[PDB]
Amino acid sequence: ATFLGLSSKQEKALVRLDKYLNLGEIAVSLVTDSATSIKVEGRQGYYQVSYKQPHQLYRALALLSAALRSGQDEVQIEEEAAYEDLAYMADCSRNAVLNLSSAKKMIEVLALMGYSTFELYMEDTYEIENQPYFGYFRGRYTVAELQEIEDYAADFDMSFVPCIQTLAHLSAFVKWGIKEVQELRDVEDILLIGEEKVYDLIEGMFQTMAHLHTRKINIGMDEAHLVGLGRYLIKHGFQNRSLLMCQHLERVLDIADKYGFNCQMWSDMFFPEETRVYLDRLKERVTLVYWDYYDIAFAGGAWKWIGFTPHNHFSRLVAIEANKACRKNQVKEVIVTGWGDNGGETSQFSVLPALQIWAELAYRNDLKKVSEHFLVSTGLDFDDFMKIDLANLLPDLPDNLSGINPNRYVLYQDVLCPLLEQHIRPEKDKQHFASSAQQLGEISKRAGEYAYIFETQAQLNALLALKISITSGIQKAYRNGDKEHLSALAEKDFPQLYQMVEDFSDQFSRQWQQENKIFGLDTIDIRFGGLLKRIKRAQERLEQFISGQIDCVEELEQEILPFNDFYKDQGLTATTANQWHLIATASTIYTT
């Protein structure tokens, strides 16, 4: 395709986007026009594209590309976006730090979908001068790295917003047993309000970020129960948390003003006479984000924080209702969040379908074109990609319940002491995982550049089917005194499970290294390594029982109880279990 009206910047962007767009030998002319967000009109090889914001050029061209692919000659497309800003925020704080190459790829995909803004969630994963422990061995971003990511987004006329923490959720930093860190602490993951060394740290934070072009930052500042209740209380006595939050936020905003920043934060804080007055003054100096995944921006969820497998389906359900509500309430700004809770085990690209869904709702208020446009963004079929969710999609789950994550807890639970066993239907769930493995093995064959993430999932599902088979088989066979069936498992199925887990670690490690810096993979080595050792223990214990070397396997004599009652009121068998250390063992492991 050839163009008239391009800037040199747009020329370079189109060189980068060429592999995605298949515009062919057509002629395109560009107009800037704020009558509508996007307009595409033309026929017989000559098209005019108009956009309101420059970044919207790239979605307009995706719509053109899709329309032509559909075999249209005549094109007449018009879109008025509901939101002035549409952002995607990746988590780089949960062990998985997006590598620069992956950040670039994501920026390109977001450009094509219509996002205006890229955000990174960094608790401690950016360098601060004079704070060598901050992000120590975490793969923290250098200033040069953050600049490179920012500048790459700016090349597509996209904005960049760092999402940091200025009070709480700094657990990876505050663990260091060095005075210059411990003196910054209130309690648990919370910094000490009123400590000048804490305000020194926070100025360091802004000094790092002042090296970027952006002057928009998310400072966190959500409310935590224990704020003011640790070393603060010892220092100062008890104080109204609202009052402390007010003290702290003013200090932070004064630092931010010094570096020219505009601050966004969670609304919580703003849900005694003189503190109410303080509150009303501060609210005017900040933008608020209202979160819900299940002068106000809305934060929606792209579900990739529940283990190894995302929930694009659930994301779609809530996106549809959230979009209605945001429109009703004239919301100007939406941030789609890609959290990574408790180890960052889910692919950074696992939620491309959810991302396209939100783009479509924002621009068209429907999903009528989601497949066609997703094909431009990814080169793949949307329904294929949506099957990435399968390890969570147990047959007959209610579709409106969140967090149900058997992908993770079936994997990590013990074999001899299976804490989640009563939440598993051993035939029904096993057959689902077995079938899912087959479906994903086929998709991976046609997934191209994304095949690697489908391979991980195919292997997980096959691993889960066999793990349930062996685990539930042992419980039955042991209860019924069937040493013959136990010997068979020990001889054939155990070595097969062990090998499958090893192969799964090798595949996951390929996925991780493709997407993330190497830092953080180590926690997963530990978890996989522990699982392997426990599988081996299970085999060994059974062998000793079969051979008569022990008279019973005490693990298998224990009554198993429900793991939690989170979905007891809804009557589910499956559940949500999303902390590895509570899934893997009933013993102490972190505690003293």
Does position 212 interact with a second copy (CB under 8 A)? The reply is no
The footprint of a second copy on residues 500-519 (CB under 8 A) is 505, 517-519
| Strand, coil or helix: 299 | strand
DSSP annotation of 142 reads P
| Site for a second copy contains 387 (CB under 8 A) | no
200: tokens are: 């020194």
Instruction: For residue 5, state whether it binds a second copy (rule: CB under 8 A).
Output: no
By CB under 8 A, tell whether 520 contacts a second copy.
Answer: yes
Based on the shown chain and the rule CB under 8 A, indicate whether residue 27 belongs to the binding site for a second copy. Answer: no
- Least Å distance, CB 121 to a second copy, is 13
| In the complex, minimum distance from the CB of residue 516 to Hg ion, in angstroms, rounded to a whole number | 14
Query: For the purposes of burial, counting CB atoms within 10 Å of the CB of 498, is it exposed (0-12), middle (13-18) or buried (19 or more)?
Result: middle
**Using CB under 8 A, which of 29, 36, 171, 371 touches a second copy?**
171
Please check whether residue 204 is in contact with residue 149, taking contact to mean a CB–CB distance below 8 angstroms: no
Amino acid at 231: R
Q: Which does 322 bind (CB under 5 to 8 A by kind): Hg ion, a second copy, none?
A: Hg ion
552 binds, among Hg ion, a second copy, none (CB under 5 to 8 A by kind): Hg ion
Q: Which does 332 bind (CB under 5 to 8 A by kind): Hg ion, a second copy, none?
A: none
Task: Identify the H or E element spanning 48.
Answer: strand 46-51
CA angle 250, 255, 260 (to 5 degrees): 115
Length of the chain: 592
> Which tokens sit at 519?
């830092």
Taking the least distance from each CB to a second copy, the nearer of 35 and 234 is 234
Point out which span in 369-377, 390-398, 411-419, 442-450 binds a second copy (CB under 8 A). 411-419
Q: Among residues 48, 38, 41, 34, which one has the least CA distance to residue 5?
A: 48
582: contact with a second copy by CB under 8 A = yes
Residues 224-243 that bind a second copy (CB under 8 A): 225-226, 229-230, 233-234, 238
Reading the block at residue 288, the tokens are 């608020």
Locate 5 and state its tokens: 């009206």
Determine which helix (DSSP H) or strand (DSSP E) holds 357, and give its type and residue range: helix 352-364
Residue 353 backbone dihedrals phi, psi, to 5 degrees: -60, -45
| Max Cα-Cα span within the chain | 84
Structure tokens at 517: 């810096």
Binding of a second copy by 526 (CB under 8 A): yes
Residue nearest to Hg ion (CB): 326
Chain residues binding Hg ion by CB under 5 A are: 89, 163, 218, 245-246, 269, 278, 298, 322-323, 325-326, 334, 551-552
Beta strands in 400-507 (DSSP E): none
The string of DSSP letters for 107-141 reads HHHHHHHT--EEEEE-SS-B--TT-TTTTTTTTPB
CA atoms in the 13 A half-sphere facing the CB of 32: 6
Footprint of a second copy on 81-100 (CB under 8 A) = 94-95
Name which of 29 and 578 has its Cβ closer to a second copy: 578
Is residue 589 at the binding interface for a second copy, with CB under 8 A as the rule?
yes
Our finding on whether 52 is near a second copy (CB under 8 A) is no
Q: Rule CB under 8 A: which of 419-438 touch a second copy?
A: 419
Of positions 531, 542, 574, 583, contacts a second copy by CB under 8 A: 531
**Quick one: how far is CA 443 from the chain centroid?**
23
Q: Is 414 in the site for a second copy (CB under 8 A)?
A: yes
Segment interacting with a second copy (CB under 8 A) among 247-255, 361-369, 429-437, 550-558: 550-558
Binding pattern for the stretch 104-133 against a second copy, x by CB under 8 A and - elsewhere: ----------------------------xx
> Shortest CA distance to 574 belongs to which of 389, 461, 408?
408
77 binds, among a second copy, Hg ion, none (CB under 5 to 8 A by kind): none
Q: Is 533 in the site for a second copy (CB under 8 A)?
A: yes
**Joined tokens for residue 435:** 């079938």
Residue 337 or 444 having the CB closest to a second copy: 337
Is the separation of the CB atoms in 49 and 29 below 8 Å?
yes
- Report, in Å, the least distance between residue 93 CB and a second copy: 8
For a second copy, what does the binding mask look like between residues 333 and 352, x meaning CB under 8 A? --------xxx---------
